[PDB]
From Swiss-Prot, chains A, B, C, D:
Keywords: Calcium, Lectin, Manganese, Metal-binding, Signal. Ca(2+) binds at D123, Y125, N127, D132. The keyword Disulfide bond does not apply. Belongs to the leguminous lectin family. Homotetramer. D-galactose specific lectin. Binds one manganese (or another transition metal) ion and one calcium ion. The metal ions are essential for the saccharide-binding and cell-agglutinating activities. GO terms for molecular function: carbohydrate binding; metal ion binding. It comes from Arachis hypogaea. It comes from the Eukaryota. Changing E92V: In minor form. This is Galactose-binding lectin. Mn(2+) binds at E121, D123, D132, H137.
C-alpha cells in the first residue's frame, strides 16, 4: 500500500520537511512557537512540506491516518488567552490567510470565517461572530471557523496536551481524543468525506492566530503522522 | 469527572490489578502468553481486576476511552496459526467460556459463537462456521464471534503490533487503528451503543484460544487504558 | 534528532512522494521500469520528491543513512545488456542529463562522463571510454562515471537483487552489500565526504540508461531509506 | 565462492546449529534469554555451532559478511539495567569467560577486561573500570571490553532493536547500523583486520552478563547471517 509516515520530537529551521508560513518562530529547544506576541493580528502556520495524496481519482479510495501531537498554550500578563491552535488539512496550494485583528480566524479563514480546509480546533476564546460556544472548546471545522460540531473543553495555561487523531477510510470518521494534564480525556468525532471537500493532494499542518487584545504562546512540542492509501 | 487510567509496560503474576482466567502464563520477561501450546482447545484471558462503570443510569451518560496496546503472534512448526487475540468488554461477572476444540471462539463465546460481550478481534484463521472472511482480519464483535464488521488485515509472525482504540461517548463510535511492522496502518470503525449492550459495570481485557490443529503463541506486551465518565 | 524515513514495496504514478524524469514507466504490478526498450539512448530516473538535508552548515554534522533496495535486469533477444542501474545522490536541483547514444552515462553525466553527484553503480557493460573494468562491476562514483573504486560483480538476467547500503556520519564511510540470487554476497566500501561533494540539500534516487546497441529492462522492485541527522 | 548463510526467526533447544554456553534459556516463544535474573554474576552466550573460516592462509583473502539481528532489553523493578548484549567473533575453541560480579565483562573477558575476540557491543551501564563513556553506548571491541571506538546510544526498555552489520573484505571496514524504536538510526564503523586478530576458523554469536546489583532481561529475537569467501 501507499504509506506516508514522519515523526518530529523536536524542530529546527532549515529542515526541508517543514514549511513555515507567518509568525512561526522555532525556539532554541526544538519547540515551535506559532504566534508573535508583539504584533496585532499575528498569524502563523507550520506545514509538512510534501503534499500527501489522500485519495485516488482512479481507485476511488481514501486514505486513513493516525496522527498524534502535543502542544502547550501559556498565558501572558494583561492579555486575553487567544486564539488557540488548529490542526488542519488544505489544498496543496494553501496560502496563509490574511492576518485579521480583533478576529479569531485561527489563521485559516477570511474575516467572515470562510476558507477551504478541514481541521480540528482547540479554541480558547469565544467570538459571537463565529458562533463560538460560551467557553473553551474543541471543534471540527469544515471550510468554516464556525465549527460543524463542538464539545466543551478546558484549556490550562502551561499544560502539555497530548492529542491522538484517527481517520477511518471507509466510515469516513474523523475521531479526536484530547488528553489533559490531570488525566481526563475529551473526545469528539465526525464524518467528513475527505474525498468531497479536499482535492487529491492536500497538506497537513498546525495553524494559529492572535488579536489586538487576545494573545498567548502557542507551542507545538511534537508531531507524529501516518497515513495509508490502499491502491489495488 | 470520573476517570480510570492504568498502564502496563510489563506484567507479573501476583499483581492484584490483573485477573488471570485460563491458560494464561506470565513470562519471565514481563510478557503475557495467553494460550497453552500443549493443549487441545487452550483458552486464556487477562482482565483488569476492577470493574469500570462505563455508563450511569443516573446521568444517562456514557464514558469515552482511549486505550492502546501491543501484541505479538509467533507461529510454531507444524501448526495452523490460530485463533488470534481479542480485546473485549464484558459484564463484571464474566466467566471464561467453555474451552472448545477445532473451534475458534477466541475464548469469549459458546460453540455456536454467541456470548455477552463487545470486542475488537485480531483473527488469523477462517472458520466457515462463523462467517470468517477468506483471510486474516480485524473485526468488531457484538455478542457474537461472527463480526458485525470486518476489514482485511494481515498477521505477521514474530511482529510486534501497536493498536490504538478510541471510543466517543456521544457519537458512540468505536475506532481502531492497527499499526503493522512495516509501517502501514489498518483502521476500522463502528457504532456500538455501549449503554445498550453492556451493564453499567463491565471489565476490560484480552482473550485468546486455540484448537486441536490450530495453535500459536499469543503475546500481550503492553497495555495502557484511560476512560472518563462525565457526571454533572 | 532529525530523521527521514520512507518505504516503498510497490510504486504507482501519481504518488507525490516520487518524481519521474525520463523514460520511467510504472508497471501494472507496482514495479518501476527505468528505460524504454524502443528508443536509442533511452534514459530514466526516479527520485524521492522531497530534498533531504544531509548536513548542516550550522552543526557541521553529516547524517548517516541506511537504505536497502531490490532490482532486476532481464535481457532482451538480440541486444547487449546495458547500461545498468545506479543509486545516487545529487543537488536538489538535479536535471536529467542529456540522453546520449552508444554511450553509457547511466543517466547522470555528460558525454564525457562528468556530472555533479555521488552514487553506487551496478554496471553491466564495459566502455573503454570511461575505464570500465573488463566485466560486470559494482562501483562508487563521485562526480564521474569513471568509478573511484570498483569490485568484480556478475549480473544475472531475471534475478532479483537485494542491496543494503550504510553510511557512517563520522567515518564518512559508504558501505554497500550486494546479495545475489544464489546467496553469495558482494561488498565494496569507500570514504566520501558527503559534506565536501554535495550541497546541504540533495535528492536520493535510481537512474539508468541505454544505447543504440545496448538495451535491457531495469526494474526497481522496492526501496526503503532512513537517514538521521544529529543536531544539538 | 565459499559462502555460509543461515537464518533464525525463532529458536528452540536441541537445534544442533546452536551451542548454548552459560545461563542461556530459550523461551516458549522462540526467543533467546541470555542471562539468569536470580543469579549474581549471571553469564550467557549463544553461538552458531559450526566454525566459519573467515580467511585463508592460502588465498590471503578475507571473507565479507552481512549479518542483521534484533534484540530487546527490558528492565526489572529495583535493579540497575546491565550489562548489555554483544555480538562477537572468537577463536573456534572459545570457552565461556569466568562469571564475574559487580563487573561488566559482557561475558567475553576476564576481570581485567582482556580477552581474545572482536565484537560490537550494546552497553547500557558505565564502569569507570573499563573506560565506559558516561552513558549508554554502542562500541567496537577488539580483545578488550574497553571499546576501541564508541558512539552515544540510548537503550529503551521493552523496545525491539534491529541491527545491520556489514564487513568489507578489502577495506577491512566493520560497519554497524542500529535502528531504534522511534525510527532514528545510530551508526559506527571501524577498520579491524580480521586476519590480524582472529585465527582462520572463528565462531559467531551473542553474549551477555549481569552483576550483583545490575540485571535485566537480554533477548535475542532473530538472527540472519551471510559470509562469502572468495577463493580462486
Ligand atoms: O521586548 S521586551 O524587551 O519586552 C522582551 C520581550 C520578551 C523577552 C523574552 C522573555 N522570556 C521570558 C521568560 C519568563 C519571564 C518572566 C516570568 S515571571 O517571573 O513569572 O514574570 C516567567 C517566564 C522565560 C522563561 C523561560 C524562558 N523564557 C526560556 C527557556 C524555557 C525552557 C528551557 S529548557 O530547555 O531548559 O526547558 C530553556 C529556556 C527561553 N527564552 C528564550 C528566548 C530566546 C533567546 C535567543 C533565541 S535565538 O537567538 O534565536 O537562539 C531564541 C529565543 C527569549 C528571547 C526573548 C525572551 N526570551 C529562549 C528560551 C520573558 C520574556 C525579552 C524581552
Ligand atoms: O508588547 S508588550 O510590552 O506588552 C510585551 C508583550 C509580550 C512580551 C513577552 C512575554 N512573555 C511572557 C511570559 C510570561 C511571564 C510571566 C507570567 S506570570 O508569572 O504567570 O505572570 C506568564 C507568562 C513567558 C513565559 C514563557 C515565555 N514567555 C516563553 C517560553 C516559551 C517556551 C518555553 S518551553 O519550556 O516550553 O520551551 C518556556 C518559556 C517565551 N517568550 C518568548 C518571546 C520571543 C522572543 C524572541 C522571538 S524572536 O523574534 O524569534 O527573536 C520570538 C518570541 C517573547 C516575546 C515577547 C514576550 N515573549 C519566547 C519564549 C510575558 C510576556 C513582553 C512584552
Ligand atoms: O487590517 S487589520 O484589521 O488587521 C489592522 C492592521 C493594522 C492596524 C494598526 C494598529 N495599530 C495599533 C496600535 C494599538 C492601539 C491600541 C492598543 S490598546 O488600546 O492598548 O489595546 C494597542 C495597540 C498602535 C499604538 C501605537 C501605534 N499603533 C503607532 C504609534 C507608535 C509609536 C508612536 S510614538 O511616536 O509616540 O512613539 C506613535 C504612534 C503607529 N501605528 C502606525 C501605523 C502606520 C500608519 C501610517 C503608515 S504610512 O502610510 O506608511 O505613513 C504606516 C503605518 C499603523 C497601520 C496599521 C496599524 N497601525 C504608525 C504608528 C493597533 C492596530 C489595525 C488593524
Ligand atoms: O429540585 S431540588 O433542588 O430539590 C433537587 C433534588 C435532587 C437532585 C438530585 C440529586 N442527586 C444527588 C446525589 C448526591 C451527590 C453528592 C452527595 S454528597 O455526599 O453530599 O457530596 C450526596 C448525594 C446522588 C448520588 C448518587 C445519585 N445521586 C444517583 C446514583 C445512585 C446509585 C448509583 S450506582 O451506580 O451505585 O448504582 C449511581 C448514581 C442517582 N441520582 C439520580 C437522579 C435521577 C435522574 C433521572 C431519573 S429518570 O427521569 O427516571 O430517568 C431518575 C432519577 C436524580 C434526580 C435528581 C437528583 N438525582 C439517579 C441516580 C444530589 C442531588 C437535584 C435537585
Ligand atoms: O430550582 S432550581 O432551578 O434553583 C434548581 C434545582 C436543582 C438543580 C440540580 C442540582 N444538582 C446538584 C448536584 C450537587 C452538586 C454539588 C454538590 S457539593 O459537592 O456538595 O457542592 C452537591 C450537589 C448534583 C450532584 C450530582 C448530581 N447532581 C447528579 C448525579 C448523580 C449521580 C451521578 S453518577 O454518574 O455518579 O452516577 C452523576 C450525577 C444528577 N443531577 C441530576 C439532575 C437531573 C437531570 C435530568 C433529569 S431528566 O432529564 O428529567 O431525567 C432529571 C434529573 C438535576 C436536575 C436539577 C439538578 N440536578 C441528574 C443526576 C445541585 C443542584 C438545579 C437548579
Ligand atoms: O524494436 S524491436 O523489434 O527489436 C523490439 C525491441 C524490444 C521489444 C520488447 C521485448 N521484451 C522482451 C522480453 C523478453 C523475451 C524473451 C526472453 S528469452 O526467454 O531470454 O528469450 C527474455 C526477455 C521481456 C521480458 C519481460 C518483459 N519483456 C517485460 C516485463 C518486465 C518485468 C516484469 S515483472 O513481473 O518482473 O515486473 C514482467 C514483464 C516488459 N516488456 C515491456 C515493454 C513495454 C511495453 C509498453 C510500454 S508503454 O508504452 O510505456 O506502456 C513500456 C514498455 C516492451 C516494449 C518492447 C519490448 N518490451 C514491459 C514489460 C523481448 C523483447 C520488442 C521488439
Ligand atoms: O520510411 S521508413 O519506414 O522506411 C523509415 C526510414 C528511416 C527511419 C529512421 C531510422 N533511424 C534509425 C536509426 C538506427 C537504428 C538501428 C541501427 S543498427 O545498429 O544498424 O541496428 C542503425 C540506425 C537511428 C539511430 C540513431 C538515430 N537513428 C538518430 C540519433 C543519433 C544520435 C543521437 S544523440 O544526440 O543521442 O547522439 C540521437 C538520435 C536519429 N534519427 C533521426 C531521424 C530524424 C528526425 C527528424 C528529422 S526532421 O524532420 O528534419 O526534423 C530528420 C531526421 C530519423 C527519421 C527517420 C529515421 N530516423 C534523428 C536522429 C533507423 C531508421 C525510420 C523509418
Ligand atoms: O579438488 S581438486 O582435486 O580439483 C583440487 C583443487 C585444488 C587443489 C589445490 C591446488 N593448489 C595448486 C597450486 C599450483 C600448483 C602448480 C602450479 S605450476 O607448476 O606453476 O603449474 C601452480 C600453482 C598452488 C601454488 C601455491 C599454492 N597452491 C599454495 C601457496 C600459495 C602461496 C604461498 S606463499 O608462501 O607465497 O604465500 C604458499 C603456498 C597453497 N595451496 C593451499 C591449499 C590449502 C591447504 C590447506 C588449507 S586449510 O585446510 O585451510 O589449512 C587451505 C588451503 C590448497 C588446497 C587445495 C589446493 N591448494 C595453501 C597454500 C594447484 C592446485 C588441489 C586439488
Ligand atoms: O579441477 S580443475 O582441473 O578444474 C582445477 C582448476 C584450477 C586449479 C588451480 C590452478 N592454479 C594454477 C596456477 C598457474 C600455474 C602455471 C601457470 S603457467 O606456467 O604460466 O602456464 C599459470 C597459472 C597458479 C599460479 C599461481 C597460483 N596458481 C596461486 C598463487 C598466487 C599468488 C602467489 S604469491 O604469494 O606469490 O603472490 C602464490 C601462488 C594460487 N592458487 C591457489 C588455489 C587455492 C588454494 C586454496 C584456496 S582456499 O580454499 O581458500 O584455501 C583457494 C585457492 C588454487 C585452487 C585451484 C588452483 N589454484 C592459491 C594460490 C593453475 C591451476 C587446479 C585444478
Ligand atoms: Ca475563537
Ligand atoms: Ca477465527
Ligand atoms: Ca557502462
Ligand atoms: Ca559495561
Ligand atoms: Mn470555535
Ligand atoms: Mn472472525
Ligand atoms: Mn563503470
Ligand atoms: Mn563499554
Amino acid at each position: 500500500a501507499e504509506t506516508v509516515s514522519f515523526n518530529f520530537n523536536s524542530f529546527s529551521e532549515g529542515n526541508p520537511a517543514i514549511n513555515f508560513q507567518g509568525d512561526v518562530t522555532v525556539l532554541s529547544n526544538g519547540n515551535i512557537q506559532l504566534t508573535n506576541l508583539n504584533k496585532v493580528n499575528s498569524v502563523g502556520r507550520v506545514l509538512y512540506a510534501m503534499p500527501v495524496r489522500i485519495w485516488s481519482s482512479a481507485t476511488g479510495n481514501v486514505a486513513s491516518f493516525l496522527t498524534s501531537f502535543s502542544f502547550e498554550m501559556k498565558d501572558i500578563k494583561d492579555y486575553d488567552p487567544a486564539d488557540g491552535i488548529i490542526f488542519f488539512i488544505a489544498p496543496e496550494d494553501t496560502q496563509i490567510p490574511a492576518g485579521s485583528i480583533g478576529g479569531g480566524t485561527l489563521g485559516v479563514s477570511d474575516t467572515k470565517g470562510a476558507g477551504h480546509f478541514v481541521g480540528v480546533e482547540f479554541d480558547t476564546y469565544s467570538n459571537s461572530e463565529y458562533n463560538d460556544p460560551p467557553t473553551d472548546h474543541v471543534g471540527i471545522d469544515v471550510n468554516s471557523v464556525d465549527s460543524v460540531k463542538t464539545v466543551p473543553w478546558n484549556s490550562v495555561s502551561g499544560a502539555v496536551v497530548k492529542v491522538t487523531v484517527i481517520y477511518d477510510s471507509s466510515t469516513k470518521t474523523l475521531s479526536v481524543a484530547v488528553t489533559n494534564d490531570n488525566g481526563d480525556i475529551t473526545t469528539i468525532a465526525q464524518v467528513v468525506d475527505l474525498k468531497a471537500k479536499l482535492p487529491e493532494r492536500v497538506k497537513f499542518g498546525f495553524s494559529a492566530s492572535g488579536s489586538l487584545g487576545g494573545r498567548q504562546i502557542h507551542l507545538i512540542r511534537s508531531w507524529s503522522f501516518t497515513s495509508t492509501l490502499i491502491t489495488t
